[PDB]
């Protein structure tokens, strides 16, 4: 159907960042233990909390 309003719309320049989603998705349950403190360890690399 026709649209009520009208739209400003056209070509424009964008660009892409670095913080992609796969480095930020992270979840954990009952994993590695740190020997100083008996707590879950740090780091997305070694599957932290």
């Amino acid at each position: 159907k026709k649209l009520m309003a009208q739209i400003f719309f056209g070509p424009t320049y964008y660009q892409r960042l670095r913080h992609m989603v796969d480095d930020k998705i992270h979840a954990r349950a009952r994993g590695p233990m740190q020997v100083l403190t008996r707590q879950p360890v740090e780091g997305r690399s070694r599957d932290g909390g």
Partner: protein
């Protein structure tokens, strides 16, 4: 006490059990039955991600000095107190030897492996009645060459006595006794690239020199008595076989070597110039 923990599934018992580790959850499970054994594993890499004891020995080394939130009046007392326990250990002399062999190896631009192998060689004996002093530099001069050779690196006696004058024979007897020590506690081809490095040549003369050295080692004519020199005249005959002016006087002054021996090797390969060239 037997100091022993053995892990065994209490329901399979087929062997010392075929078990696996799930490091992503830090648990262990007998793969046959599928039951856990224990939980909460300790990491084996995060400590290496977190942050020479064998050469410094069981007693541990400690250098002390100054900081920001301190006072100069007592850090100078600390600087004059840091030597109040160096006489309790022989490790002050061990680290003095370590420092001096560090001086030597980095003076001859030797790498970390050579330095640590010389450290190993000193730490190996470090005290015998066979050692018996002997100027305290003969032992390190032997040890650096021992570590160099066992690093598969060859260095000349002339380089060694350019580093330290050890009168060449206390050095030799130290080498013999250290050889016996290491055999109780239990190669000249690489000289060639250093010679051509000091002479500045491309590859084909070096490869030809290696081939001719192999062939002359195989056949005959020791002829020079320490065949280091007949290796050197193999380079001499190769470079005279090519057309680059590397004349005999220049070679002799460069390598600090006898020109008469060069002419002797030149004559004996002038006889045997036949079977020594591949292309």
């Amino acid at each position: 006490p037997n100091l022993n923990i053995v892990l065994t599934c209490p329901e399979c018992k087929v062997y010392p059990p075929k078990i696996v580790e799930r490091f992503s959850e830090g648990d262990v499970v007998c793969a046959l039955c599928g039951l856990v054994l224990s939980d909460k594993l300790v990491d084996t890499r995060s400590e290496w991600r977190t942050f020479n004891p064998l050469l410094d020995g069981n007693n541990l080394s400690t250098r002390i000095g100054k900081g920001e939130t301190t006072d100069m009046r007592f850090t100078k007392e600390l600087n004059k107190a840091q030597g109040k326990n160096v006489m309790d250990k022989k490790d002050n002399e061990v680290q003095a030897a370590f420092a001096k062999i560090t001086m030597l190896c980095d003076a001859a631009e030797l790498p970390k492996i050579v330095k640590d192998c010389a450290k190993e060689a000193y730490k190996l004996c470090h005290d015998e009645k066979t050692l018996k002093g002997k100027s305290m530099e003969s032992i390190m001069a032997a040890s650096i060459l021992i570590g160099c050779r066992r690093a598969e690196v060859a260095r000349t006696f002339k380089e060694i006595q350019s580093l330290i004058h050890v009168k060449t024979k206390e050095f030799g007897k130290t080498l013999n006794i250290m050889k016996n020590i290491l055999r109780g506690k239990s190669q000249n081809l690489t000289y060639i690239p250093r010679f051509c490095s000091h002479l500045g040549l491309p590859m084909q003369v070096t490869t030809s020199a290696e081939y001719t050295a192999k062939k002359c080692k195989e056949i005959k004519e020791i002829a020079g008595k320490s065949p280091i020199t007949i290796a050197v005249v193999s380079i001499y005959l190769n470079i005279l076989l090519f057309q680059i002016p590397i004349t005999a006087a220049k070679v002799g002054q460069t390598l600090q070597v006898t020109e008469g021996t060069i002419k002797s090797g030149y004559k004996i390969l002038y006889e045997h110039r036949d079977k020594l060239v591949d292309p």
